[PDB]
Structure 1
Amino acid sequence: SRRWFHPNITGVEAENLLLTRGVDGSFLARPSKSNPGDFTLSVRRNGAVTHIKIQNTGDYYDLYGGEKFATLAELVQYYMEHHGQLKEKNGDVIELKYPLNCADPTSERWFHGHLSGKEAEKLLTEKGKHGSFLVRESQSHPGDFVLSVRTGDDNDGKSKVTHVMIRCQELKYDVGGGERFDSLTDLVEHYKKNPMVETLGTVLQLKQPLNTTRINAAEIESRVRELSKGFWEEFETLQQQECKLLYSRKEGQRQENKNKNRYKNILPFDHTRVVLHDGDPNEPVSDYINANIIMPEKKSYIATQGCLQNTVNDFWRMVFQENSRVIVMTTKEVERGKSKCVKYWPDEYALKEYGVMRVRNVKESAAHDYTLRELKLSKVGQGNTERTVWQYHFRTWPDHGVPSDPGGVLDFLEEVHHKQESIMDAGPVVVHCSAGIGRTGTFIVIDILIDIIREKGVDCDIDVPKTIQMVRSQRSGMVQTEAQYRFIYMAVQHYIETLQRR
């Protein structure tokens, strides 16, 4: 499903692959070898290869002569279902027809590379469960692989670990007979669908990879130390899982809602979008905002885009309807001379009407990294609906990449948390940047992780990529870059240290 991404290939290897194994319309994507956030889409057209740059500074994937996207899987799905839409600098059309599959197993959750049968047995015994499995290098037979599978009752002998040898002959893979596969992923997927049955009848069911990302929070420093010499590899394994999250976005794709999206292809999932009720009867579609509910799976969030001039009223309808009392803004209104969010709040001491809502800015307070605006929101014609909405406007995030130190963000998020916790029956905390996925996702995931450690103290289990995957199932592309991914680990580490210091 995401086999067109080749994590460890060079430009010339990509060219030769497309020229010898592909046809016109063949394509693949790959990282830049030294440049994080740069990717290349390599495509074959008229017997030649073209390389198309995709940049991601933290907000979205920006395809040259194409559009902006929330994930590379969403980018490929869009253009595979939309020909004539990707053009060269000269205007000529670049068709993405045939993904060119990668055989490299390194971003599979189940692939552990160098590892002994004894090490894999203890890992499967301590962490594993029925159907927990891994693939590793053989050591006895160089170039071969072993599949190790735990099967049993959930140390009393009711469970066991089997080792199935996997031969590699002609760069095809087999388990001793039957089909020979072009890759270990194809072998795993096959024996996931069609499990091996032993002679005495044990079914070697490959239910889940062994979890290697879950850590005890107290031991965060050791995991970060280990990832710092990696973070790229762990991030790319997470990114491989995004092909499971192509959920429908049909409401955002409606003609009627086109001009309510900051970026035409960055859309909320139908199953978690905020639906706005009590709309204008004369506006035929008034139930739409580019926003999703994010539930940790007590505090929930709405992840949304920066307002457009035509969505400011809808934004306030959302805040009112959802009973939100805290907004987190993670962008300046303008960065690099581009508008990222329209000003949707009044100047200090001023009162403005936004459709049927009225907002007073009571007071602003400037801190180093942020401005707090104390806002009063009510429905026009109904005085007893007034509530305070506290807008925390983070002002010092760099235009590209992440802050060099997480202290400013953590102090900000602590103040947000206490504000939210002090307000009886407050609704979800609204979080927004520009597209509402990169910074927004980073702030939300840090908030969710810190909240676990707040309830359960320094001795609790956290699992960063599992948390991100769960949030990504609720809005597209939450947490955009490897730099945000590392920043998340650094923020949790700093949080833990300040608590051990105390």
Structure 2
Amino acid sequence: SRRWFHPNITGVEAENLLLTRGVDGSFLARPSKSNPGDFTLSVRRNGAVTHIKIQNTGDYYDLYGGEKFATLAELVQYYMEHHGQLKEKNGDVIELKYPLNCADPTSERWFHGHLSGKEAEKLLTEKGKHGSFLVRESQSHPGDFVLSVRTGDDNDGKSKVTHVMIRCQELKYDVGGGERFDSLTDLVEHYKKNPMVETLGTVLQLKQPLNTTRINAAEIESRVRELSKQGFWEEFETLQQQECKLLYSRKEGQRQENKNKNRYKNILPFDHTRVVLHSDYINANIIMPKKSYIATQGCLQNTVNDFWRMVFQENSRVIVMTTKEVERGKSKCVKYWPDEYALKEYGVMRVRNVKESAAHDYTLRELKLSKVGQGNTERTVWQYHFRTWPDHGVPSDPGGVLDFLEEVHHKQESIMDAGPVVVHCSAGIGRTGTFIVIDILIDIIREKGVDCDIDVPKTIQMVRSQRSGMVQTEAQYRFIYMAVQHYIETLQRR
């Protein structure tokens, strides 16, 4: 559910909150507002408060003293069910028992804050379907709210927009009668499941929030203008608040004959999208939006053979490596390719490094992949190794990635019936997710023109349902917008 995350709260406010409205076992999560990628797991225990630091440089949620995780929902869930691992540095144990729910409706998809009643009717008239609703701050009475909901059938005749007053009196919310709720979210969820019925029959059904993220790709520059007043951060954490619906099973990655095949213990592939080898386990996920992807981790020494089994089985002809072998003084991926002009065997597979071509931003390696025994199974697999990506943060200018991405797309289209494009970094969720999302959004634009419809958060959430935590930080989220805008400019400048 992820109500335990408080988006706009200070460190001391979380202390008072756990100590007045919480008991030992209560916990919450919060970001440091000035330091992005800085998160704290504030846990109450032994009549005091324990602050556990979490850092996200772009690849994973690194919990200090603990493990690394793909999302905060998977972090909190892991420790609530695997009790004993979260320890107080000095041996003592931290217990996560009672999620302290937040009341802020800012990170909700349906809450539009300081929005007028005429704008709300226009957007619902234009973009809303049956059941599309929004909640805005009250035009008339300061402090109150208005639930605007569209009903009908999808205009000419019978579709309407009903406005429901939401009174807020002494921190409780109600629709003028019945039950008073502790938050706007609780009120919406209640009438989302038990919808209001009008006096003459019409059911005020809260189906889906009014979409306000889909834009015309031609006006990308206008949306980047408003997201940078903020807009970017409040749009990204609204995306992060929907990760609680993506706790799909990871039973295969958790099995113990597979625990050594994962670079990071608690970053595992979803069971319904994982790549199955013909043992059968590799930390890799099929990503589907004629182009699909394979998002996977950087190879370990004991999974290099499994990696080349996957590349062969999927008929992949392009590999995208978005990491160095060593970054931040730690190994992020094993060298799984032979030296130039050399021929090496990785299990039942054989790879020849035909020729390496060095560019400003990347190294291109023409590799010949074949299976030992079968006489003519050779295929050219092109490895695009991006090297200029920094250790922390994102590139300040998207030009190098876009040209690196344009070259990969041309390569993939030159090969008839080529399989999915293999993308990998360290954990295979951050840079890997940022790359796949940018390529997915560009593939839409390059086909159906610059005046097409793109939805950055809806695209990311779709990709996140196929692999945990695709796109890691807000800096990457912002970089996705900047990359798509730069690509939009270069075509229309041409």
Asked if TM exceeds 0.5, the reply is: yes
CA shift, 1:139, in A, is 2.1
TM-score (norm 1): 0.98
8 Å contact kept, 2:268–2:283 = yes
* CA offsets 1:373-407 (integer angstroms, 9 cap, x no match): 00000000112111000000000100000000000
CA shift, 1:178, in A, is 1.2
CA shift, 1:170, in A, is 1.8
CA shift, 1:450, in A, is 0.6
Q: Any unmatched runs of 5+ in structure 2?
A: none
Distance in 2, Cα, partners of 1:180 & 1:359? 67
Q: Secondary structure at the match of 1:235?
A: helix
* CA offsets 1:293-328 (integer angstroms, 9 cap, x no match): 0001x2000000000000000000000000000000
Q: Secondary structure at the match of 2:107?
A: coil
What residue is the counterpart of 1:432 in the other structure?
A: 424
What residue is the counterpart of 2:135 in the other structure?
A: 135
Distance in 2, Cα, partners of 1:74 & 1:450? 30
Distance in 1, Cα, partners of 2:34 & 2:408? 37
CA shift, 1:157, in A, is 2.5
CA shift, 1:10, in A, is 0.4
8 Å contact kept, 2:117–2:139 = no
Distance in 2, Cα, partners of 1:309 & 1:199? 68
CA shift, 1:77, in A, is 0.4
8 Å contact kept, 2:27–2:98 = yes
Distance in 1, Cα, partners of 2:77 & 2:181? 26
What residue is the counterpart of 1:244 in the other structure?
A: 245
8 Å contact kept, 2:317–2:381 = yes
* CA offsets 1:87-134 (integer angstroms, 9 cap, x no match): 122121111111000000001010001122211110100110100000
CA shift, 1:155, in A, is 2.3
Distance in 2, Cα, partners of 1:107 & 1:24? 27
What residue is the counterpart of 1:258 in the other structure?
A: 259
Distance in 2, Cα, partners of 1:228 & 1:383? 58
CA shift, 1:337, in A, is 1.8
Distance in 2, Cα, partners of 1:118 & 1:367? 54
CA shift, 1:250, in A, is 0.3
Distance in 1, Cα, partners of 2:145 & 2:412? 52
Q: Secondary structure at the match of 1:458?
A: coil
Distance in 1, Cα, partners of 2:416 & 2:82? 48
Q: Secondary structure at the match of 1:373?
A: strand
* CA offsets 1:305-358 (integer angstroms, 9 cap, x no match): 000000000000000000000000000000122100000000000000000000
* CA offsets 1:441-474 (integer angstroms, 9 cap, x no match): 0000000001101001111000100000000000
Q: Secondary structure at the match of 1:39?
A: strand
Distance in 1, Cα, partners of 2:453 & 2:291? 19
What residue is the counterpart of 2:483 in the other structure?
A: 491
Q: Secondary structure at the match of 2:435?
A: helix
How many percent identity over aligned positions? 100
* CA offsets 1:70-97 (integer angstroms, 9 cap, x no match): 0000000001111111012212111111
Distance in 1, Cα, partners of 2:157 & 2:122? 15
Distance in 2, Cα, partners of 1:427 & 1:113? 45
Distance in 2, Cα, partners of 1:459 & 1:383? 49
* CA offsets 1:33-81 (integer angstroms, 9 cap, x no match): 2000001110001000011110000000000111100000000000111
- 1:376 matches 2:365: no
Q: Secondary structure at the match of 2:177?
A: coil
8 Å contact kept, 2:318–2:411 = yes
* CA offsets 1:227-286 (integer angstroms, 9 cap, x no match): 111110100000000000000000000011000000110000000000001xxxxxxxx0
Distance in 1, Cα, partners of 2:386 & 2:118? 50
Distance in 2, Cα, partners of 1:212 & 1:155? 20
CA shift, 1:153, in A, is 1.2
CA shift, 1:142, in A, is 1.1
Distance in 2, Cα, partners of 1:84 & 1:419? 49
Q: Secondary structure at the match of 1:289?
A: strand
* CA offsets 1:408-448 (integer angstroms, 9 cap, x no match): 00000000000000000000000000000000000000000
Distance in 2, Cα, partners of 1:465 & 1:447? 14
Q: Secondary structure at the match of 1:167?
A: strand
CA shift, 1:169, in A, is 1.4
Superposition RMSD on alpha carbons, in Å?
0.6
What residue is the counterpart of 2:193 in the other structure?
A: 193
Q: Secondary structure at the match of 1:385?
A: coil
Q: Any unmatched runs of 5+ in structure 1?
A: 278-285
Distance in 2, Cα, partners of 1:348 & 1:66? 40
8 Å contact kept, 2:88–2:94 = yes
Distance in 2, Cα, partners of 1:398 & 1:222? 28
Distance in 1, Cα, partners of 2:451 & 2:156? 29
What residue is the counterpart of 1:25 in the other structure?
A: 25
Distance in 2, Cα, partners of 1:216 & 1:309? 45
Aligned length: 493
CA shift, 1:156, in A, is 1.5
Distance in 2, Cα, partners of 1:118 & 1:363? 63
- 1:469 matches 2:461: yes
Distance in 2, Cα, partners of 1:140 & 1:490? 38
Distance in 2, Cα, partners of 1:396 & 1:137? 46
Q: Secondary structure at the match of 2:150?
A: strand
Distance in 2, Cα, partners of 1:328 & 1:115? 43
What residue is the counterpart of 1:292 in the other structure?
A: 285
What residue is the counterpart of 1:99 in the other structure?
A: 99
TM-score (norm 2): 0.99
CA shift, 1:224, in A, is 0.3
* CA offsets 1:159-190 (integer angstroms, 9 cap, x no match): 00000101111211111111111111111111
Distance in 1, Cα, partners of 2:376 & 2:406? 30
